[PDB]
Ligand binder design. Structure first.
Ligand code: FE2
Ligand code: FE2
Lengths: 285, 281
């Protein structure tokens, strides 16, 4: 039974892109160093500790009271914003993956903790946030990529992600059996990369009175697709402390879908947003 | 040869929907009163009279200079911002048209002025700005509507929009003959509504001709023009509907998106901003 391929972080990017086309997913081993993972985890500890907001919680109010979720970690976790978000290997993968569609940016990056006693999810595709994706044919340029960061170990017992290899080629999800999937068992520092249309399920957490399984999910989408999370209320000084790449990911610059769009997107006064704003960056004059 | 159907501005919206389904386009007669057209034209004149810019012009630099252009007219034309953008008939059409797709907003609205002596555009579908639309099948919920506001007369001579009726059902555009199209001859204040996938062409101007093109898209699609640099006092002078159109509020794609889009801190954008509107504090 074929398993998810595990590649070294410094492996060939064309190999990675071909695995996405064939299997639909793969794992990078030891992409993030321990100190970066540990730093990010402390920042996420802090956000987990903040008690539930008083009024409306748009996503959280739609799920049961046990739902553990922290949105838009880019705005509250410097290690994500300044280091993880701009990881060169992730962007090498994105550049290759999105060659046909053009520029991409961050639609969302958020935290989940899955506590002991949670059942596995049903098999599904991530095509709900932008429902138009449901009607995109297989042969169309991909518009979404999932980048999944385990922040605790992912094990068979605690709900390692279940992925059905090659299932992006299926017409529909159908009703597959659990033994058709393989597990994304991983350690902190690893990353799981999942192609659009791949059938998968969150593994829940079958441990008894154990610690929660922690994960950060980042969705990189074609700039044609509206970000779920809008980073437009971030302080200007915080945004100007990021690199150009980081700013581009968070929607603060004009971007370019592929031809036949020959102009761009996210612009105003027929000029680039960053020029209208006179936006500085950490790595630009 | 069947022509574009002309409806009264107070016609039933279900009749308008049937025409978009069958023909792919129709014309509303006298939607905007003379005084609205006049004030909008006066505002556009002011922008056209201001000296040209010292730097790159992203869209304008892609066309020959007989193509005249005022971008994102909502930022400079109060009549568009306060009256045209929130027209109840246009929004009745949009609400019906996008019932399978969810919320919609303004991707772009800009002036095109075509000087005399220009030939017509090639036939095309409006699927270039968001190329993913090219791969969306006919059966999918529509994600874009083209709304065309003539600000001068559209005649057979001066480049009335050329529209091929029923062409949304075509698998591909190819290279059509001009005689397949019919003309959207119109007076200022009329509006031409064109469904996604309908093959059409700008008529150029073979005598300037003035038109404002507005593209209302599913909120799933990133606006071409971003209105995020609008002064807060300008934003708060608009109605809630206007603010929603210009990207200043959280919006709702169709279920299975049960949450929304364009939000932060799991809250509505307008709540995080504490945004007032003309018709809601
Ligand atoms: Fe999922
Ligand atoms: Fe067009």
């Amino acid at each position: 039974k074929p398993q998810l391929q595990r590649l070294a972080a410094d492996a060939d990017v064309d190999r990675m892109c071909r695995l996405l086309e064939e299997d639909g997913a793969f794992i990078l081993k030891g992409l993030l160093p321990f100190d970066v993972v540990e730093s990010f985890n402390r920042e996420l500890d802090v956000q987990m500790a903040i008690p539930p907001p008083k009024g409306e919680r748009l996503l959280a109010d739609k799920y049961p009271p046990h739902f553990k979720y922290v949105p838009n970690v880019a705005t509250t976790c410097p290690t994500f914003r300044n280091t993880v978000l701009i990881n060169p290997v992730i962007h090498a993968i994105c550049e290759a993956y999105f060659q046909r569609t053009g520029d991409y940016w961050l639609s969302a990056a958020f935290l989940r903790e899955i506590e002991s006693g949670m059942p596995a999810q049903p098999f599904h595709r991530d095509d709900a946030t932008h429902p138009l994706m449901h009607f995109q044919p297989l042969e169309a340029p991909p518009v979404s990529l999932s980048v999944i960061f385990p922040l605790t170990e992912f094990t068979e017992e605690n709900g390692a992600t279940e992925v059905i290899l090659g299932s992006h080629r299926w017409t529909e999800v159908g009703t597959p059996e659990r033994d058709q999937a393989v597990l994304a068992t991983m350690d902190p520092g690893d990353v799981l990369i999942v192609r659009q249309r791949v059938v998968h399920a969150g593994g829940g957490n079958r441990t008894t009175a154990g610690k929660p399984r922690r994960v950060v999910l980042a969705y990189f989408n074609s700039v044609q697709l509206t970000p779920f999370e809008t980073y437009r209320t971030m302080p200007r000084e915080m945004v100007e402390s990021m690199t150009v790449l980081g700013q581009r990911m968070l929607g603060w610059r004009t971007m370019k879908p592929s031809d036949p769009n020959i102009v761009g997107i996210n612009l105003i006064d027929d000029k680039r947003l960053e020029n209208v704003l006179q936006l500085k960056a950490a790595d630009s004059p």
